[PDB]
Amino acid sequence: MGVQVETISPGDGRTFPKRGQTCVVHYTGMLEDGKKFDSSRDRNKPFKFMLGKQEVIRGWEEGVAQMSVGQRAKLTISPDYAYGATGHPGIIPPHATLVFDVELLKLE
């Protein structure tokens, strides 16, 4: 499958990321079983990426683009939109569906 976006808390419902803008997010990354493997909240530093530059997994590029500024959403991402058959050695297993808790804090 692709990316499913479930709202946790609404944003402004009007400001959506456009290609080339920098998205500033807090995120927690979990395997489908619930195990956390990455979180910007545990580092207390928001994560920044530029949309459309493929600095993040495809699921983020298509999922975050569906979020409005200030929204918190749950992204469920199939492995083809994620780390695929290879996974990531010792962090993400092969063919892993990933769940992300993402808050879009602002655009730059």
GROMACS .gro file of C-alpha atoms in nm:
model
  108
    1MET     CA    1   0.000   0.000   0.000
    2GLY     CA    2   0.099   0.366   0.014
    3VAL     CA    3   0.076   0.607   0.305
    4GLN     CA    4  -0.233   0.641   0.524
    5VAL     CA    5  -0.275   0.968   0.716
    6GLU     CA    6  -0.488   0.964   1.033
    7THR     CA    7  -0.540   1.291   1.217
    8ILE     CA    8  -0.450   1.311   1.584
    9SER     CA    9  -0.498   1.686   1.633
   10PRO     CA   10  -0.605   1.932   1.361
   11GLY     CA   11  -0.382   2.200   1.216
   12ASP     CA   12  -0.496   2.526   1.063
   13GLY     CA   13  -0.651   2.330   0.773
   14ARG     CA   14  -0.529   2.587   0.519
   15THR     CA   15  -0.147   2.587   0.495
   16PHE     CA   16  -0.011   2.280   0.317
   17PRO     CA   17   0.356   2.221   0.230
   18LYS     CA   18   0.458   2.295  -0.127
   19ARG     CA   19   0.757   2.143  -0.304
   20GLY     CA   20   1.080   2.318  -0.207
   21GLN     CA   21   0.963   2.441   0.134
   22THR     CA   22   1.139   2.325   0.449
   23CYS     CA   23   0.914   2.126   0.684
   24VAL     CA   24   0.990   2.150   1.056
   25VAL     CA   25   0.853   1.846   1.237
   26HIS     CA   26   0.864   1.651   1.558
   27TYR     CA   27   0.830   1.280   1.497
   28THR     CA   28   0.835   0.940   1.663
   29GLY     CA   29   0.904   0.635   1.445
   30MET     CA   30   0.774   0.292   1.541
   31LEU     CA   31   0.765  -0.051   1.388
   32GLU     CA   32   0.422  -0.202   1.332
   33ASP     CA   33   0.453  -0.396   1.660
   34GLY     CA   34   0.488  -0.059   1.838
   35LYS     CA   35   0.863  -0.063   1.902
   36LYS     CA   36   1.012   0.286   1.878
   37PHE     CA   37   1.325   0.309   1.664
   38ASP     CA   38   1.366   0.687   1.616
   39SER     CA   39   1.223   1.003   1.774
   40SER     CA   40   1.313   1.370   1.745
   41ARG     CA   41   1.127   1.430   2.073
   42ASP     CA   42   1.382   1.221   2.265
   43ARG     CA   43   1.655   1.449   2.126
   44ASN     CA   44   1.447   1.765   2.199
   45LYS     CA   45   1.538   1.903   1.856
   46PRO     CA   46   1.286   1.928   1.570
   47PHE     CA   47   1.378   1.765   1.240
   48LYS     CA   48   1.393   1.969   0.918
   49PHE     CA   49   1.370   1.846   0.560
   50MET     CA   50   1.304   2.014   0.227
   51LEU     CA   51   1.000   1.868   0.053
   52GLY     CA   52   1.065   1.723  -0.293
   53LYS     CA   53   1.441   1.668  -0.245
   54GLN     CA   54   1.406   1.301  -0.136
   55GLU     CA   55   1.585   1.365   0.194
   56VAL     CA   56   1.323   1.141   0.360
   57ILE     CA   57   1.131   0.825   0.275
   58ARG     CA   58   0.867   0.849   0.004
   59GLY     CA   59   0.594   0.796   0.265
   60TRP     CA   60   0.698   1.120   0.437
   61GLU     CA   61   0.715   1.320   0.113
   62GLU     CA   62   0.361   1.218   0.022
   63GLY     CA   63   0.222   1.207   0.376
   64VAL     CA   64   0.352   1.535   0.519
   65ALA     CA   65   0.237   1.710   0.201
   66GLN     CA   66  -0.118   1.616   0.309
   67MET     CA   67  -0.081   1.784   0.650
   68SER     CA   68  -0.157   2.142   0.745
   69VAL     CA   69   0.065   2.358   0.964
   70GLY     CA   70   0.010   2.270   1.329
   71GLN     CA   71  -0.143   1.929   1.257
   72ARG     CA   72  -0.043   1.613   1.439
   73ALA     CA   73  -0.102   1.298   1.235
   74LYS     CA   74  -0.031   0.925   1.235
   75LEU     CA   75   0.136   0.804   0.914
   76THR     CA   76   0.118   0.431   0.839
   77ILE     CA   77   0.367   0.352   0.564
   78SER     CA   78   0.409   0.030   0.366
   79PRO     CA   79   0.764  -0.094   0.299
   80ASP     CA   80   0.765   0.020  -0.066
   81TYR     CA   81   0.721   0.379   0.064
   82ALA     CA   82   0.977   0.307   0.337
   83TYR     CA   83   1.292   0.094   0.363
   84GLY     CA   84   1.161  -0.186   0.133
   85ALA     CA   85   1.283  -0.544   0.121
   86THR     CA   86   1.628  -0.444   0.248
   87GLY     CA   87   1.518  -0.258   0.557
   88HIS     CA   88   1.793  -0.098   0.762
   89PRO     CA   89   2.055  -0.323   0.930
   90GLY     CA   90   1.984  -0.357   1.299
   91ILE     CA   91   1.719  -0.082   1.303
   92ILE     CA   92   1.442  -0.165   1.056
   93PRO     CA   93   1.370  -0.525   0.948
   94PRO     CA   94   1.293  -0.633   0.590
   95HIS     CA   95   0.944  -0.560   0.455
   96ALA     CA   96   0.854  -0.341   0.753
   97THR     CA   97   0.537  -0.137   0.777
   98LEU     CA   98   0.624   0.178   0.972
   99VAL     CA   99   0.403   0.402   1.187
  100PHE     CA  100   0.502   0.765   1.244
  101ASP     CA  101   0.356   1.016   1.489
  102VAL     CA  102   0.430   1.347   1.315
  103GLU     CA  103   0.360   1.706   1.421
  104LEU     CA  104   0.410   1.974   1.153
  105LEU     CA  105   0.534   2.272   1.357
  106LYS     CA  106   0.604   2.526   1.081
  107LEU     CA  107   0.720   2.579   0.723
  108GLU     CA  108   1.032   2.770   0.622
   0.00000   0.00000   0.00000
